[PDB]
Symmetry: D2
Subunit: 106 residues, 4 copies
């Protein structure tokens, strides 16, 4: 998937985690988000199209995906332990990550 496709996947599944009425729905959405974040690792965003992939600026870009991927990891452990309220509380943590990368690079 390109960056825009992975972003729609993150957006749809974040909404699911906000509306989830059960653990299985949250677990399924977090697994799709993990796959979209991992796949977005390789992308060059438009604002950085004229920087080499080995540049410090691209390092600072990708750093936000480490944070998101880390937060999804924890949210899935919380969802697996039956903590349905907590797992959703993930949504507040993920949103801050979404916003920081968008503010710097979108």
């Amino acid at each position: 998937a390109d960056l825009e496709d992975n972003m729609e996947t993150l957006n749809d599944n974040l909404k699911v985690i906000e509306k989830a009425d059960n653990a299985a729905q949250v677990k399924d959405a977090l697994t799709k988000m993990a796959a979209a974040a991992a796949d977005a690792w390789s992308a060059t965003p438009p604002k950085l199209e004229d920087k080499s992939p080995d540049s410090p600026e691209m390092h600072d870009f990708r750093h936000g995906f480490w944070i998101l991927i880390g937060q999804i990891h924890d949210a899935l452990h919380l969802a697996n332990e039956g903590k349905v309220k907590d797992a959703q509380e993930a949504a507040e943590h993920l949103k801050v990550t979404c916003n920081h990368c968008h503010q710097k690079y979108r």
Copy 2:
């Protein structure tokens, strides 16, 4: 790229880091490992091909890549602070994560 190709990138760069003398050599190798681990995320390995995509086995397979990505994240911070020997030692911690996933799924 395919799972065996990402494993060759992980193996080759782990050896670059062992034999490295400076932070720029360690940084470049870890950047390539981060990209290979991220790219291997959605791979299905041969020994799990007849399992459900949401089998506990496929969950546990992907959990290994969360561990590896987390460790590469920390090693690149140490390399970025010019801590060459610490970054090299951190890359040595990766081997436990290599071995745990191989023991179960290779």
Copy 3:
């Protein structure tokens, strides 16, 4: 030190980081927050004093400090690389973790 004293150190240093101009101010504040979070680890908060020490509530109380310590770890790496604005933004992510634990246990 006691839990309220560590909370005053976290609150005061979070504000130092917001108003900071340079990396040394951000580094010193985050070092104090790391020590306060670590010291608060084994505290029992007033609203959980009649629960088992291994109640899910006390497990969930300590999980919050794991999240906070992880975030302070990453913020100090960014401050150590001289990324003043990123470190300050990272300190802003702490507020979600502040709020989640307060919502349940303060």
Copy 4:
């Protein structure tokens, strides 16, 4: 507890996690290790007794406790999900952390 007391606690509970015949024994030992690691945060080791607590060398010392505390966090999520074999596999990850700090600072 002083550093030596927290270290005996880490050592006794690591052995428990190596010998555990059930999840509850592993969970109890990981909780004691988390408390000992958090409490060891504030300590100055003998080899660094003549460095100020705000020094870079003490920062590099404490960094090893972030790694250990992070690894215990994950081991407890794995133990909680009923993964008794995996949870123990933690013991291999923790040992590497033990050894790195000891090699540099003991």
